Design a protein around this ligand. Structure first.
Ligand SMILES: Oc1cc(O)c2c(c1)O[C@@]1(c3ccc(O)c(O)c3)OC3=C(C4=C([C@H](c5c(O)cc(O)c6c5O[C@H](c5ccc(O)c(O)c5)[C@H](O)C6)[C@@H](O)[C@@H](c5ccc(O)c(O)c5)O4)[C@@H](O)C3)[C@@H]2[C@H]1O
Ligand SMILES: Oc1cc(O)c2c(c1)O[C@@]1(c3ccc(O)c(O)c3)Oc3cc(O)c4c(c3[C@@H]2[C@H]1O)O[C@H](c1ccc(O)c(O)c1)[C@H](O)[C@H]4c1c(O)cc(O)c2c1O[C@H](c1ccc(O)c(O)c1)[C@H](O)C2
Ligand SMILES: *[C@@H]1O[C@H](CO)[C@@H](O)[C@H](O)[C@H]1NC(C)=O
Ligand SMILES: [Cl-]
Ligand SMILES: [Cl-]
Ligand SMILES: [Cl-]
Ligand SMILES: [Cl-]
Ligand SMILES: [Cu+2]
Length: 235
C-alpha cells in the first residue's frame, strides 16, 4: 500500500502533486486485475490540472509514501520490482504506447529487492528524461508487490500480484529529439497470467531467479536509480 506524493526535478521538490500533476487514486489500495482499465493509471485516471516542466537530460524523481510523507513508504513484506514507463499525453495511455525507461528487480550483491531499496531511499526513485519530441507526456511508475503472487488474481481474486501504479503529467520543453519515442506496450494488455514475473513464489524460489515482466528497457532510455535525491524533512 503506497502512493506518489510528488516529484523532484534535478533534486528540486516540485511540491505536493496529489490530484494536481499526479492522477492520484483516492487511496493506496493495489490494482490486481490485469485486464482492467485501472492498469493504465490506477482507478481515477483523468486529466489533472498541471504538468511538471522538465528538459531532456534532467533527473525526474518520483516520491512514494504509505500514509504520510516520508513515513515507512511501503510495508517491508511487499518485496518486488519497480519500473517506469512513458507515453505521449495525446494517447491518454491507450494503445501500444508505453515505453519502458527503467527496470529494477533484485540486486544480488546487496541481497535487496527494488522495494527494499525504495524504503531505504525514503520513497525516491528516478529516471533521466530522454531525448524525445518536446511535448506533453505521462510517466507511469509501477511497483509490483509479490507477497501474494504465488496465486493469480484471475483464479483467486483475494490473492495475486499487487500493482501500485501512478501517472505523472510531465511536459518536456527542451529536447533535440535525437531519440524519437518508439512503439510501446498497452496497459492493460502487456501483463497476462503467463507473463514472466506475474506469478512467482518469493518464499521458495531464490530472488536471483526472478525475471521481471517484459518489455525490456528501451535503448533510448538515459538511465535511472532508486536513491534519495532530496530530504523532505528540510521543508
Ligand atoms: O484553459 C485550459 C488549458 C489547459 O491546458 C487545461 C485546462 C484549461 O484545464 C485542465 C484542467 C483544469 C481544471 C481541473 O480540475 C483539471 O482537473 C484539469 O484540463 C485539461 C487540460 C488539457 C487538456 C489536454 C490533454 C490531453 O488531451 C490528453 C492528456 O493525456 C493530457 C492533457 O493535458 C494535460 C496537461 C495539463 C496541463 C498542462 O500545462 C499541459 O501542458 C497538459 C496532460 O498533458 C495530460 C491538452 O489539451 C492540454 C493542453 C492544452 C494546451 C496546450 O498548449 C498543451 O500543451 C496541452 O491541456 C485536457 O484534456 C484537459 C488543461 C488542464 O489544466
Ligand atoms: O498466522 C500467521 C501467518 C503468517 O503469514 C505468518 C505468521 C503467522 O507468523 C510470522 C510471524 C509472526 C509474528 C512474528 O513476530 C514473526 O516474527 C513472524 O512468521 C512467519 C514465518 C514464516 O516462515 C512464513 C510466514 C510467517 C508469517 C509471519 O507473520 O508467512 C509467509 C507468508 C506470508 C504471507 C502470505 O500471503 C504467504 O503466502 C506466506 C510464509 O508462510 C512463511 C515464509 C516462508 O515459508 C518462507 C520464507 O522465506 C519467508 C516466510 O515468511 C517470512 C515472513 C516474516 C514476517 C512476515 O511478516 C511475513 O509476512 C513473512 C519471510 O517472508 C520469509
Ligand atoms: C477484471 O476487469 C475486466 C475488465 O474491466 C472485467 O471484465 C472483469 O470483470 C474484472 N474481474 C473482476 C474479478 O472484477
Ligand atoms: Cl508542497
Ligand atoms: Cl538512498
Ligand atoms: Cl537535448
Ligand atoms: Cl537517476
Ligand atoms: Cu499493501
Amino acid at each position: 500500500h503506497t502512493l506518489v506524493w510528488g516529484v523532484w526535478v534535478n533534486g528540486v521538490d516540485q511540491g505536493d502533486g496529489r490530484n494536481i500533476y499526479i492522477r492520484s487514486p483516492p487511496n493506496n489500495n493495489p490494482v490486481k486485475n490485469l485486464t482492467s482499465p485501472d492498469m493504465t493509471c490506477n482507478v481515477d485516471n483523468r486529466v489533472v490540472p498541471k504538468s511538471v516542466p522538465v528538459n531532456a537530460g534532467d533527473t525526474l524523481t518520483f516520491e512514494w509514501y504509505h500514509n504520510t510523507r516520508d513515513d515507512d513508504i511501503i510495508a517491508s513484506s511487499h518485496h518486488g520490482p519497480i519500473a517506469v514507463y512513458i507515453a505521449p499525453a495525446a494517447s491518454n495511455g491507450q494503445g501500444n504506447v508505453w515505453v519502458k525507461l527503467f527496470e529494477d528487480a533484485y540486486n544480488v550483491t546487496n541481497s535487496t529487492w527494488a522495494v527494499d531499496r525504495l524504503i531505504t531511499a525514503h520513497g525516491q526513485h528516478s529516471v533521466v528524461v530522454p531525448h524525445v519530441a518536446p511535448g506533453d507526456y505521462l510517466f507511469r511508475a509501477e511497483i509490483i508487490a509479490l507477497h501474494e503472487a504465488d496465486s493469480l488474481y484471475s483464479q483467486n481474486p483475494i490473492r495475486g500480484a499487487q500493482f501500485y501504479i501512478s501517472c505523472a503529467q510531465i511536459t518536456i520543453n527542451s529536447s533535440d529529439d535525437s531519440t524519437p519515442l518508439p512503439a510501446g506496450v498497452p496497459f492493460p494488455g502487456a501483463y497476462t497470467d503467463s507473463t514472466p514475473g506475474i506469478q512467482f513464489n518469493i518464499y521458495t524460489t531464490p530472488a536471483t531467479s526472478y525475471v521481471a515482466p517484459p518489455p525490456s528497457v528501451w535503448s533510448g532510455a538515459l538511465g535511472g536509480s532508486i536513491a534519495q535525491v532530496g530530504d523532505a524533512s528540510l521543508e
